[PDB]
Amino acid sequence: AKSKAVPFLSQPEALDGSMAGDVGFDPFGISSVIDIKWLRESELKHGRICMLAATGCLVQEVVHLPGPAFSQKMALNAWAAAPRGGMISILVAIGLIEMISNRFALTATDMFANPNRVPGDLGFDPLSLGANPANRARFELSEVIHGRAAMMGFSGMVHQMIVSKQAPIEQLMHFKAVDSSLMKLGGAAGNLGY
Amino acid sequence: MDSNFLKYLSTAPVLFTVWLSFTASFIIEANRFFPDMLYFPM
Amino acid sequence: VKRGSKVRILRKESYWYQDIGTVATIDTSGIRYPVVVRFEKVSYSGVNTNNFSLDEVVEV
Amino acid sequence: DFSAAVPFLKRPSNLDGAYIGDVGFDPLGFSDVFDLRVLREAELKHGRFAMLAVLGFIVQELYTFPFFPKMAPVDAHDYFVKQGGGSQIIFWISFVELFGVVALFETLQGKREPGDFAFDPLGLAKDEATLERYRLAEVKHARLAMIAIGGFIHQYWVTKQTVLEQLGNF
Amino acid sequence: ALFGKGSMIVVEDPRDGCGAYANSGACHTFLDEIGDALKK
Amino acid sequence: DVAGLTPCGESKEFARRLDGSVKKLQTRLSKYEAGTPPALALQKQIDKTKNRFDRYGKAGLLCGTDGLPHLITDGRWTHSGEFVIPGLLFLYVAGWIGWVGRSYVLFARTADKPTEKEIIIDVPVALSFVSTGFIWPFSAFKEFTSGNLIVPADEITVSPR
Ligand code: CLA
Ligand code: CLA
Ligand SMILES: CCCCCCCCCCCCCCCC(=O)OC[C@H](COP(=O)(O)OC[C@@H](O)CO)OC(=O)CCCCCCCCCCCCCCC
Ligand SMILES: CC1=C(C#C/C(C)=C/C=C/C(C)=C/C=C/C=C(C)/C=C/C=C(\C)C#CC2=C(C)C[C@@H](O)CC2(C)C)C(C)(C)C[C@H](O)C1
Ligand SMILES: CC1=C(C#C/C(C)=C/C=C/C(C)=C/C=C/C=C(C)/C=C/C=C(\C)C#CC2=C(C)C[C@@H](O)CC2(C)C)C(C)(C)C[C@H](O)C1
Ligand SMILES: CC1=C(C#C/C(C)=C/C=C/C(C)=C/C=C/C=C(C)/C=C/C=C(\C)C#CC2=C(C)C[C@@H](O)CC2(C)C)C(C)(C)C[C@H](O)C1
Ligand SMILES: CC1=C(C#C/C(C)=C/C=C/C(C)=C/C=C/C=C(C)/C=C/C=C(\C)C#CC2=C(C)C[C@@H](O)CC2(C)C)C(C)(C)C[C@H](O)C1
Ligand SMILES: CC1=C(C#C/C(C)=C/C=C/C(C)=C/C=C/C=C(C)/C=C/C=C(C)/C=C/C2=C(C)CCCC2(C)C)C(C)(C)C[C@H](O)C1
Ligand SMILES: CCCCCCCCCCCCO[C@@H]1O[C@H](CO)[C@@H](O[C@H]2O[C@H](CO)[C@@H](O)[C@H](O)[C@H]2O)[C@H](O)[C@H]1O
């Protein structure tokens, strides 16, 4: 009755090994506080965005759309250089995708109001790749793991773009270490401000 | 963690002081990094 | 009305006028205010129950 | 009635020998006031930090990593304060200590031994009997290393020589 | 076919024509930093 | 420009405000040595003062005869960043707080003891509610039209008059 992920803690309730990637990891007991359906919807959503975000950073390093506004190898510069009208178009399109794909059940009080609604199942299978029932367990597992990995990887790449003002692949290929002269962490209250 | 200590931290004055300190804390941090915002910049 | 039903108060000087209470008992004697209604809200006096007539009480 | 360690002192009521390494030694009566589980959590945590640190001293005089400058361990504390690697180590210790807070809540709720993190990758504990023998050894080593690290740092503060070089000289 | 001679997809080599390890001054890879850390 | 005001970038009174505000700090900086902590602090204050005046000059704000920025709040779109757009941000946050609190009081009415839920807040449920506020204009307008925001006049306690 111990967790398999954290062997010295008790196995958390609402984690019963049914969900993909349910290795028994909830030390802080958020699943005991927050319904596991919302947490799995949010975990799948974070990971799917991060999978695209990781692929985004690496692919924007390799390939660009044409034009001078899209010629930013370093990914954090593409945020500023890309045409604002189109980035707000992306943002509005994301909001529309959120309202239609969630079917106007967007809040924590009305998503999963339909008992047919499943965490992460927005009805997205354009090429019917989940038509085979046998692969469903593996795919759902591999989606969750790819999502988690991409959360960790994208977080790394962003904070490596902050530290070293370099895109991730050409930061690996032109690696220059941390000098520690700059990028000191904290310090706003140690010197009493300024 | 103890359920009675969590029920104590859910009391109205504790949540009020923590939430308004968190609220005050991000007003302070937003005015630290981005000060003197008399207007929405446009 | 009948015991246990939810009722709307029509006594204009009541604290719970046009609020919902529930009927506890109804006397059968020649009582002037037989319907005893209990209320979730407490009055300014702190009382949460009062006796009313039938013509001051409507089932909801 | 009386303590195994101190013959003339009475054995503390809360010390029943359930925790390994118990010899009844608690004159100041900290177990009469505080939870023993928490105190054994603290004893094993202080001791494990001290054991890692005494091995830390000895290996750091014997070898240092080529990417780091060669220097004394207290000077290493100050260098890694200013360099950033101390903050790294503090962050990762703090990160592990978050789940340590969860672990201590599991101990207070009765469902975990005070020093158990189920950390037996190399399967050295075979059955209960050897686990008890190792556990008594762990507490004895933990206590001995707490005294030893205090000696190593205090001796360096008095005489600016490392522990291996202080044995080598004088 | 979308895009076109004028304004076509820009594909560039991030590697910049140097290897993963065993490089000169112009290229210092992450693995080169591991090697530089080991030999110092 | 608007209302006989002058853009802050070309008004001489805004420029003399900036120059006087920097002279006050420079005469405080003139009593300290270069690397000392008060001098470093005072120089950062000078930098912040210059940044504030530089940003205000290029922002399209209009200054008065006094050299201070004035806000035009009549609705014109060339000045919507001073009241209309900050006001829209406010009304979104305020309606968020109102919708979230209203949703929590309606939840707390359906509790076993409704008044403990208001002095000891069910924090997971209240956090579910604070997440609900991002689409409050639609949620509240659908609530209004579906007869769930407004109660009829004959369900409200009123005085005899
Ligand atoms: C987290 C996702 C994410 C975000 C926020 C961005 C953001 C941006 N991208 Mg990047 N990109 C992404 C993913 C992302 N990208 C992925 C996955 C790829 C690989 C196909 C790329 C490849 C890419 C290139 C080649 C370029 C950008 C560029 C840009 C910038 C301008 C927008 C543009 O022209 O996009 C162009 C976008 C594409 C060509 C593909 C993006 C579409 C992906 C597949 C998301 C699709 C999901 C969508 C919402 C539908 C799913 C709905 C359903 C599941 C419910 C902007 C900074 C430009 C730039 O300035 O960078 C230098 C540019 O030249 N993007
Ligand atoms: C209502 C429809 C509509 C209209 C009329 C416009 C009009 C415009 N857009 Mg916008 N846009 C829209 C919807 C629309 N957009 C939506 C829904 C999105 C989000 C997916 C965007 C995202 C977007 C970006 C990111 C950019 C524009 C840009 C532009 C401008 C230049 C267009 C151009 O040169 O095209 C001729 C060029 C093409 C037809 C090239 C298309 C390039 C390929 C097909 C992109 C790859 C798609 C990728 C795989 C995305 C998949 C995800 C998607 C399926 C959800 C123009 C003002 C650009 C701009 O402002 O430049 C000044 C710009 O940077 N738009
Ligand atoms: C699940 C996601 C996991 C996220 C992991 C986070 C990774 C990064 C975390 C920090 C990395 C190392 C930090 C060393 C850096 C460090 O310790 O700097 C020290 C800094 C204080 O400055 P000092 O007093 O140290 O000055 C020292 C002198 O030497 C220099 O003047 O500590 C802070 O308060 C900074 C952090 C902000 C604290 C508030 C954060 C925002 C609060 C949001 C709500 C709570 C969130 C958690 C708060 C802890
Ligand atoms: C909703 C949500 C999620 C999400 C998500 C996210 C973050 C999605 C992000 C999606 C993105 C980044 C979409 C980008 C579209 C880019 C386009 C259309 C580019 C058009 C270029 C044009 C028109 C041009 C041009 C030209 C111009 C003008 C002039 C030239 O000199 C240059 C050029 C030749 C190029 C997911 C899916 C993960 C899960 C869940 O369901 C919830
Ligand atoms: C593509 C691209 C860009 C972009 C972009 C976008 C749209 C970015 C959005 C990115 C997102 C959604 C990032 C989310 C990351 C989530 C993380 C790291 C989760 C951490 C949780 C952890 C580690 C945990 C845990 C734990 C659990 C599970 C159990 C608990 O009991 C305990 C514990 C808490 C310890 C930009 C804009 C830069 C432009 C660029 O040109 C191209
Ligand atoms: C579902 C569905 C379909 C679909 C689809 C789609 C869009 C599928 C796309 C799936 C994707 C984009 C998966 C990408 C995962 C990326 C990962 C795991 C990266 C992790 C990075 C890490 C760990 C790292 C790192 C790094 C660090 C920090 C240091 C850096 O210096 C470098 C480095 C990079 C090494 C379709 C539409 C076909 C139809 C079908 O009917 C239904
Ligand atoms: C900084 C740094 C590193 C490091 C490090 C680290 C993390 C070092 C950690 C060191 C630690 C945690 C040391 C812990 C010491 C505790 C002691 C001595 C307790 C004494 C109590 C006694 C004697 C008692 C008692 C009592 C009992 C039980 C019963 C009572 O009724 C009565 C009584 C009061 C008598 C190293 C060193 C590796 C080198 C590196 O380059 C730089
Ligand atoms: C300041 C600072 C540093 C630091 C530091 C650190 C970690 C300092 C740690 C200091 C420690 C651990 C002091 C404790 C020593 C143990 C004692 C005195 C107990 C002795 C036994 C006794 C009294 C009796 C024993 C008994 C007898 C008679 C015999 C039988 C047994 C018993 C009955 C128990 C750095 C290095 C980080 C550098 C930086 O500059 C900041
Ligand atoms: C066929 C359309 C069907 C629906 C149309 C309804 C549109 C809804 C509102 C449209 C708003 C237009 O959004 C506005 O237009 C373009 C979009 O890049 C941007 O305009 C920008 O890029 C264009 C394109 O090269 C430049 O010529 C222009 O100088 C620059 O300002 C504006 O900064 C943005 O504010």
mmCIF file of C-alpha atoms and ligand atoms in Angstrom, chain D residues 5-6 25 46 50 53 57 73-78 81 143 145-151 153-154 156-157, ligand 8:
data_model
loop_
_atom_site.group_PDB
_atom_site.id
_atom_site.type_symbol
_atom_site.label_atom_id
_atom_site.label_comp_id
_atom_site.label_asym_id
_atom_site.label_seq_id
_atom_site.Cartn_x
_atom_site.Cartn_y
_atom_site.Cartn_z
ATOM 1 C CA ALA D 5 23.719 3.993 29.890
ATOM 2 C CA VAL D 6 23.594 6.110 33.056
ATOM 3 C CA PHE D 25 20.347 8.400 27.634
ATOM 4 C CA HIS D 46 21.590 15.397 11.396
ATOM 5 C CA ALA D 50 27.274 14.653 9.319
ATOM 6 C CA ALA D 53 30.153 15.661 5.497
ATOM 7 C CA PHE D 57 36.126 16.383 4.199
ATOM 8 C CA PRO D 73 36.601 22.566 2.740
ATOM 9 C CA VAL D 74 35.640 25.711 4.711
ATOM 10 C CA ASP D 75 37.106 27.795 1.882
ATOM 11 C CA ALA D 76 35.006 25.541 -0.344
ATOM 12 C CA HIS D 77 31.907 26.622 1.611
ATOM 13 C CA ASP D 78 32.711 30.288 0.963
ATOM 14 C CA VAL D 81 28.553 30.596 -1.662
ATOM 15 C CA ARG D 143 26.096 10.086 16.392
ATOM 16 C CA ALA D 145 29.955 11.490 12.786
ATOM 17 C CA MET D 146 28.035 14.394 14.382
ATOM 18 C CA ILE D 147 30.808 14.683 17.030
ATOM 19 C CA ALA D 148 33.507 14.061 14.361
ATOM 20 C CA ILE D 149 32.392 16.843 11.931
ATOM 21 C CA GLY D 150 32.252 19.339 14.823
ATOM 22 C CA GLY D 151 35.824 18.326 15.642
ATOM 23 C CA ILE D 153 35.568 22.185 11.538
ATOM 24 C CA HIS D 154 36.595 23.421 15.046
ATOM 25 C CA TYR D 156 40.411 23.828 11.261
ATOM 26 C CA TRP D 157 39.153 27.081 12.879
HETATM 27 C C1 LIG G 8 29.976 28.846 10.798
HETATM 28 C C2 LIG G 8 30.082 28.304 9.360
HETATM 29 C C3 LIG G 8 30.612 26.813 9.031
HETATM 30 C C4 LIG G 8 30.111 25.622 9.876
HETATM 31 C C5 LIG G 8 29.743 24.660 10.527
HETATM 32 C C6 LIG G 8 29.333 23.434 11.356
HETATM 33 C C7 LIG G 8 28.611 22.262 10.700
HETATM 34 C C8 LIG G 8 29.649 23.416 12.664
HETATM 35 C C9 LIG G 8 29.273 22.219 13.543
HETATM 36 C C10 LIG G 8 29.718 22.237 14.799
HETATM 37 C C11 LIG G 8 29.369 21.049 15.755
HETATM 38 C C12 LIG G 8 28.781 19.751 15.152
HETATM 39 C C13 LIG G 8 29.578 21.172 17.077
HETATM 40 C C14 LIG G 8 29.232 20.001 18.020
HETATM 41 C C15 LIG G 8 30.197 19.204 18.452
HETATM 42 C C16 LIG G 8 29.833 18.040 19.391
HETATM 43 C C17 LIG G 8 30.020 18.186 20.721
HETATM 44 C C18 LIG G 8 30.594 19.481 21.287
HETATM 45 C C19 LIG G 8 29.674 17.044 21.664
HETATM 46 C C20 LIG G 8 30.691 16.500 22.341
HETATM 47 C C21 LIG G 8 30.475 15.322 23.344
HETATM 48 C C22 LIG G 8 30.247 15.596 24.656
HETATM 49 C C23 LIG G 8 30.190 17.060 25.187
HETATM 50 C C24 LIG G 8 30.050 14.391 25.650
HETATM 51 C C25 LIG G 8 30.156 13.147 25.196
HETATM 52 C C26 LIG G 8 29.971 12.009 26.203
HETATM 53 C C27 LIG G 8 31.264 11.499 26.981
HETATM 54 C C28 LIG G 8 31.732 12.189 28.266
HETATM 55 C C29 LIG G 8 31.796 10.231 26.591
HETATM 56 C C30 LIG G 8 30.598 9.131 26.221
HETATM 57 C C31 LIG G 8 29.686 9.628 25.358
HETATM 58 C C32 LIG G 8 28.975 10.996 25.947
HETATM 59 C C33 LIG G 8 28.244 10.649 27.292
HETATM 60 C C34 LIG G 8 27.896 11.550 24.899
HETATM 61 C C35 LIG G 8 31.045 26.528 7.677
HETATM 62 C C36 LIG G 8 31.991 25.346 7.713
HETATM 63 C C37 LIG G 8 29.838 26.152 6.847
HETATM 64 C C38 LIG G 8 31.853 27.841 7.048
HETATM 65 C C39 LIG G 8 31.284 29.072 7.182
HETATM 66 O O1 LIG G 8 32.283 29.948 7.659
HETATM 67 C C40 LIG G 8 29.964 29.183 8.263
#
